[PDB]
Amino acid sequence: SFETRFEKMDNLLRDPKSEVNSDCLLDGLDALVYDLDFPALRKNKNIDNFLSRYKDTINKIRDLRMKAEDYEVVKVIGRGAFGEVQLVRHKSTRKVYAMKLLSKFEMIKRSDSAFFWEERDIMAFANSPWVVQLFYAFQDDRYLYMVMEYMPGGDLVNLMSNYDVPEKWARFYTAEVVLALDAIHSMGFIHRDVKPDNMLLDKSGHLKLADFGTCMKMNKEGMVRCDTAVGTPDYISPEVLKSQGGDGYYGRECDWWSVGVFLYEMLVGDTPFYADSLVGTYSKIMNHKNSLTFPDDISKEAKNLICAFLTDREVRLGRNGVEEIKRHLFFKNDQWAWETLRDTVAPVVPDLSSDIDTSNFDDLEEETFPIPKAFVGNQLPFVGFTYYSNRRY
Amino acid sequence: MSFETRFEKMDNLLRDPKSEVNSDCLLDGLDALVYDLDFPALRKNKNIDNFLSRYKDTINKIRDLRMKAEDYEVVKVIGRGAFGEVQLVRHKSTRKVYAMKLLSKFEMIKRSDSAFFWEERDIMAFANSPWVVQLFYAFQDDRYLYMVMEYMPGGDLVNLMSNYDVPEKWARFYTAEVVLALDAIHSMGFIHRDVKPDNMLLDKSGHLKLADFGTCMKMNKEGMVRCDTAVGTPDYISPEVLKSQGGDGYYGRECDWWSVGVFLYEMLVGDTPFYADSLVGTYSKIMNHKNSLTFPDDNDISKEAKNLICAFLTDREVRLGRNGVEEIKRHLFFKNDQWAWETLRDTVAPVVPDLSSDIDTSNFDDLEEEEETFPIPKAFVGNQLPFVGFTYYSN
Ligand SMILES: CS(=O)(=O)Nc1cccc(CC(=O)Nc2cc(-c3ccnc(F)c3)cs2)c1
Ligand SMILES: CS(=O)(=O)Nc1cccc(CC(=O)Nc2cc(-c3ccnc(F)c3)cs2)c1
What positions does the domain Protein kinase occupy (chain B)? Predict the structure, then answer.
C-alpha cells in the first residue's frame, strides 16, 4: 500500500543500523562536496554549479554536526601506525572522553581490511559492562573519530610493569577476561588479538576490552575463513599463524590460547614463547609442545590452566564452551562468584586526582592524498561511519 | 548555542520541507551518485566499485519504495513543450486524479538552461494561495523530473478566448483575478516575466489560478531581477525584458503589468497589439509600442478599457503599477456593481465548467505524438547533479 511504502521508507531513515539513515545520508553529501571541490574537476559545470548551489548549506551542516574542534585535547594516550588515541574534553558539555583517530589517507594507502567497521559496531551496540562504549563516531576529509568512555585505570601492560602480580590478582583478571571474551563471542565475533594492551581498567579497577580492529564475524558453524594471519607475534595461536589459502579455517578457541599467554605473562613475568628476534618467537609458538617451560612459586592449578590453553586447538580447554573454563580448579576461590564478579571490589582500585587524571598513561609526544586531477572518490569507503544523528538509546 | 540546540537545529533541518538538506534531498544526493558512477570505466576505481557494491541492495529498495512514474496511470496528454509534456494522470493506489508536468533531463543538459524548474517547484509547493496551482509531490529518475499538481479542468484562457467574443464585464473579471494572482506571486518575491493566457488556468468553479512558472525569477533586495537568457515568442514580453538580454539591465515587477495590458487588449480586440508574421517583426513593434499601438474603428471598447490598456502599454517609468497594486485596483475600468476585490473569488465566475467526470478533458485540445538519452561516460560527468534536491512530498 501507499502508507506501507511511506512507513517502510520512514523507518529506514530512523534505524541506527540502516545504510540510508540520516547519518549515512549526510555523510554521502559531505563526501561528494569533499571529493568534488578541486579546481581540475570544477572545469565541469555540472560539478561547478552543484558545488556553488550547496556552498552555504554544506558550511551550515559542517558547522552544526560534530567536528574535531568541539573537543579540547588534554593528552595523547596512545599511538599506532594508522592513527592515535587521545584524552579529550567536549568544550560545550565539559564531558571527558577518550577519542581514537584513524588516518583516512593511511587506511586507503594499502590496509586490506575495512577493520574500523567492526570496531564501531562492537562498541556502539555491545551494551556490555565488559566492552568500552562508543558515544559518538564522526569524520572529516582527513580522519575518523571514535568518542569512547575514558578508562582512567590504564591497561594491564602498565599494571604488570609496576607490580609482581600475585596469583589471587591473576585469577581475578583472567576471570574478567573470560567473561569479557564470552560477551564478544555471544555477539558472534572472534577477537583474534587478545593481549594486555587491549585489557583496560575503569575508575573502579574492573576490566573492559578495547581495540576491536581485528574482530571478525563468525559464520553459521562459529568459524572464520582467513588466508592471512592476524594478531600479535607473542599472543598469536599456532592455527592463526599457519592460516593460509589452503587451510585457514578456525573458531573462537584462538582467543582461549591468548588467555593462556596472558596468564603465563602475569605469573612468570615474560611471554612463554619470547625469543630475542621476532622470527624466533614465531618458531617457538609453532613448537609450543617442546618450547613451553616454567622457571624454578606458580601453583599446580595455575600451571595446569596455562598448559590447558597452550595446546593444539583439538585438545584446548574451551573447545566445548566456557563452562569447562569456568569450572577449572584454578578459579576455585572463597572471595567471588562468576555471576557477581564485576560487583566485587577489584584487587587494585585506581586512586585518581581528577576527571582528567592520566597517571596510568605513559607520556607520549601529516601527509594527505594529493589534489586529484580527476574524480577519485577517496571519501566514499567511509560513508555511513557517523554515529550521531541516528543513535540507539 | 548548546550541544542540544545544535542537535535539534540539525534534526529540524532533516524534516523541514523548505530545507536543502532534508531527508528527500539527501536521498536524491545518493540516488545521483549511484546513477552517475555505475559505469564499467569508472568502476575500475575500487573506491567507486566497493561503494556501488555496498549500496547495491539498498539503492534498489529505496528506488522501489519512493514515488516513481509507474505509480501513475496516464489518461491523456494535455500539453507539450520543447523540454517536456503535461499529462492528466490517476495515482493507481489512491485512485486520485492529478496533472503531471514532465521535463527531460537529457534535453535540459543538451540545450543547457537546467535551473528554471526550481522557481516553478517552490512557487507551486509553498505558495499556499487560491491563485496558484498546488504542487502535491515532485519526484524524478535518471531520465525525467515530475511535478504532481491539482488538475484545473476548466482549461485555459486561450481556449476561452477562442470560443467567445469576450464581453467587457468578463474581461474586467479575468483581468482583476490576474492582478490578484500576480500580486500573490510578487508577495512571494517572484517576477513572472512572460504572463500569457496559456498561464491562466480555470478550476472546476471557473476561477483563475496561474500555472507554468518556467520563466519565473526571484527578486533581489531592491525587488529587481536581471537576465541573460533569450526570449521565446515576444507577444506578451515587456520592452524592458526584451532590452535586458545578456544581463544589460535590471528590471522590476512592472514587466508583469505590461503583460496584463497585452491580455486585456487581446480579450477585447481579438488579436495581440504587436503581432507580426515573424518573431523579429513582433519585437520591432513592441520596441516601437508608442507608434505601433492602435485600436480598430469600432465604438465597442469603452473609454476606461482603452485607458487601462494604454496605462499598462507604456514605458516602465510611467506605467500603472510602478507605485504598487492599489493604483491598478483603483483604476476606473474596475468600477462595478457585481464584485469587490477582497471577495472576488467567492463570486460566481462568468463561465462555469460543465464537467461529465473527474477525468473530463473537453476543455483540452487533442494532443498527437523517440527519447534520445545521454551516452556511456568514459569519465565522471555528473549529469544527475543539477537535479539533486528536486524531490518534494506533501503530508
Ligand atoms: C594499529 S592502528 O593504527 O590501526 N590503530 C590504532 C591507533 C592508535 C592506537 C591503537 C591501539 C588502541 O586500539 N588503543 C585504544 C585505546 C582505547 C581507550 C579507550 C578508553 N579509554 C582509554 F584510555 C583508551 C580504546 S582502543 C590502535
Ligand atoms: C517550455 S518547456 O518545454 O521548458 N516546459 C514545458 C513543457 C511542457 C508543457 C509546458 C507548459 C506548461 O507548463 N503547462 C502547464 C499546465 C499545468 C496544469 C496544471 C493543472 N492542471 C492542468 F490541466 C494543467 C501546469 S503547467 C511547458
Answer: 72-334
Residues B25 and B127 in one domain: yes
Ligand nearest to the CA of A78: 1
Pair (A318, A389) in one structural domain: no
CA distance A231 to A258: 10
* DSSP 3-state of B155: coil
Q: How was this structure determined?
A: X-ray
Interface of B with A in 8-67 (CB under 8 A): 9-11, 13-14, 20-21, 23, 26-27, 29-30, 33, 37, 42, 45, 47-48, 50-51, 54-55, 58, 61-62, 65-66
Clarify whether residues B379 and B305 are in a common domain: no
Which of chain A's residues have a Cβ under 8 Å away from the Cβ of B26?
Answer: 22, 25-26, 28-29
CA distance A185 to A253: 10
Contact at CB, A61 and B381, closer than 8 angstroms: no
Residue A61's nearest CA partner among B55, B121, B47, B29 is: B29
Residue B191 near residue B252 (C-beta atoms within 8 A): yes
Q: What spacing in Å lies between the alpha carbon of B89 and ligand 2's midpoint?
A: 14
Q: Does B163 touch chain A (CB under 8 A)?
A: no
B365 lies in the same domain as B256: no
| A296 is annotated as an active-site residue | no
Cell triple for B158: 486561450
A79 annotated as a binding-site residue = yes
Residue B80 annotated in ligand binding:
yes
CA B199 to centroid of ligand 2, rounded, Å: 8
Q: A363-372: long-range contacts at Cβ-Cβ below 8 A with a sequence spacing of 24 or more?
A: A364/A75, A364/A76, A364/A77, A364/A78, A364/A79, A365/A76, A366/A103, A366/A105, A366/A142, A367/A105, A368/A105, A368/A141, A368/A142, A369/A105, A369/A108, A371/A38, A371/A40, A372/A38, A372/A40, A372/A41
Q: Across the interface, do A90 and B3 touch by the CB < 8 Å criterion?
A: yes
Chain interruptions in chain B, by residue before each (C–N > 2.5 Å): 369
Asked whether residue A135 falls in the same domain as residue A173, the answer is no
Q: For position B18, which CATH number holds?
A: 3.30.200.20
Please name the residue whose Cα sits nearest to atom 4 of ligand 1.
A82
Distance A98 CA to ligand 1 centre (A): 9
C-beta of A85 in contact with ligand 1 (< 6 A): yes
CA–CA gap between residue A217 and residue A195 (Å, rounded): 19
DSSP 8-class letter at A153: T
Give me the CATH number covering residue A238.
Answer: 1.10.510.10
Beta bridge partners of A208: A200
Amino acid at B49: D
Resolution (A): 3.0
C-beta A33 within 6 A of ligand 1: no
**Nearest Cα to A198, choosing from A120, A267, A119, A103?**
A119
Asked if A275 contacts A320 with a C-beta cutoff of 8 angstroms, the reply is no
Contact B172, B339 (CB under 8 A): no
State the total domains in chain B.
2
Residues A343 and A228 in one domain: yes
Are residues B136 and B50 both part of a single domain? Answer: yes
Give residue B218's domain range. 156-354
A74 and A165 inside one domain: no
